[PDB]
Symmetry: C3
């Protein structure tokens, strides 16, 4: 399976598992993440989510082939279900970033609660290098999380951060040796899952309630511009340039 | 007295003084803090407040006995007067955190202006460990102050920060050796008190004016949920578990 | 000229050049900066701005003589044109802070995108030491950028930050040796200027769109109070005190 799932000690562990494609997110994986996060809200015996990935990468971003598949989905697109499920999840989420977190690998962290990283973790949101724009309301949430200057160094200039730089900016709050990241993140998730459940749920609701409506509105504003860029010559050329091993040209 | 007060060089020095109970806040102390902060607004010759505490602790949080006293107060509860007085204080406040600042010891700092700490200072807002929720509008202000990731590591996971971690997160901006914290904080308070008074008052008004209304609204939203949790089985059990030296159980 | 301008590789390089007065901003310089930033919006072949200054200072703030010139300007004051042009600039701006950035030298950075500094850079916004109030919407933007505690240590207490402290607070995101700051900042500006132009422009629009309207409203609120302080006894006395080599007295 592309998403490994286990449930113990009232923690739902979700492990992204396509190490062959550097844990690139496709339709199937988005659908499965959405399914599990929705499950967490409705089961009162699920009190924390631990999210991580197998191997040396957290995720390399959107799967390219699956990104540009002409065959449109039945019903709501899986990426949209995922963004809605993670942005509205009532359950506290601990995320353990085990390696490079690129694009949607970075932006999904803004909707997690406890954000921890290994020393080998890296972070990038290079929307401009591919000719696209911020998604998952990161145009609102990234500056709130790290300030305007870090947010622009990431989103406009395409900077890659290491784990220590992410910590100093406040994007992550703990950095562990690679070999203990998961065990230490699980210990924290288990502790949260053992606390008074309504206390935790209400506390998160109060915290997330401040920007809840603007988060949904910003995803729609970004989405319109994103769709337009995805279908434009600028996207084609950014992508073609990389595969043709040349500098992109924009007249 | 539980609050030592002096006035010199146009600085009102407020020193919390219940070292026997680790400077735990009770009704009397809240009332006295409220009285002094209100005085600061109305006296034009009081131009800065220096807030600190005696001994090795800044404050251990709410006094438990006084917290759950069935005998209700006459008029407005002292904690409410305090939160209103500190959130609306027009006078600049320098706070020198001399040791552990727990619960309301942490959240009151979000309503101070200059936030300084000793090397022995520690910071915690473990609302979830006691089965409660954020107060004093910290569900809004804590993420603004340190970002979403630090704010959740504090409020949901119950993390304890040392002084250097608080500095790196931006919760405090200076860390001093214990034996000079107070003298160095007073020097800064005296300098501010010697500046053009309307310049300082208006500058603070502009800064605080951005979230002024949302701060009051958020305290009311938090307050309803807080009262409900305080009277619930989850609070009883969280507290009983600690005193009975056992793991809490929430079905 | 007081502003050196060059255009190469689709980067408009703007270098503030009054090293004789420590790069103090006067009417002429504001007008020239406004002219160039407006040019950047309307020329599709200008895709990044690099802003820096000659010598050992970025800017010492407002030119005092020019500040209090009784002869009023024809049309819109140059400072207002500049603040409007930089706050609404559609072009990404890389700013390389080569030395002390004082007052408007600090606040203009909140409207730049990529904020980089030399090791000799220093930062100060001492509005209260001169009897004035925050400008250029820094009463809103500074706390968003660095948190409430850093913002107050700057604006109320008049703290001077070095480059490493600015980095740790997130006001700047890179610190370079003095002798490479400009070359490294230009390399980044050139890279941004080579990316898909609508991708970059829209990305910045989404990021800046969140606070765009409040930034303009806050400049007007600050402006009214500022004008009042500038014409008051408090300003006269703050300034006179410095020149008369004495402590200011405010009854
Ligand atoms: Na649940
Ligand atoms: Na006063
Ligand atoms: Na342009």
């Amino acid at each position: 399976k592309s998403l490994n799932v286990s449930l113990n000690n009232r923690v739902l562990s979700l492990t992204i598992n396509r190490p062959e494609l550097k844990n690139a997110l496709n339709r199937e994986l988005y659908a499965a993440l959405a399914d599990e996060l929705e499950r967490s809200n409705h089961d009162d015996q699920i009190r924390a989510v631990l999210l991580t990935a197998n191997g040396d990468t957290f995720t390399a971003g959107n799967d390219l082939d699956d990104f540009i598949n002409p065959v449109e989905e039945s019903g709501t697109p899986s990426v949209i279900r995922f963004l809605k499920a993670i942005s509205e999840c009532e359950t506290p989420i601990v995320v353990a970033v085990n390696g490079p977190a690129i694009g949607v690998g970075l932006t999904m962290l803004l909707h997690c609660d406890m954000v921890y990283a290994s020393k080998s973790a890296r972070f990038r949101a290079p929307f401009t290098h591919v000719g696209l724009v911020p998604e998952a309301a990161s145009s609102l949430l990234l500056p709130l999380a790290v300030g305007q200057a870090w947010a622009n160094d990431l989103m406009l200039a395409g900077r890659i951060l290491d784990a220590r730089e992410a910590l100093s900016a406040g994007l992550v709050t703990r950095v562990f040796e690679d070999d203990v990241l998961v065990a230490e993140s699980l210990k924290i998730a288990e502790q949260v899952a053992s606390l008074a459940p309504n206390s935790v749920k209400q506390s998160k609701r109060l915290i997330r309630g401040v920007n809840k409506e603007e988060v949904q509105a910003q995803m729609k504003r970004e989405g319109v511009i994103f769709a337009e860029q995805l279908a434009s010559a600028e996207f084609k050329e950014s992508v073609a340039a990389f595969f043709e091993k040349r500098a992109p040209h924009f007249a």
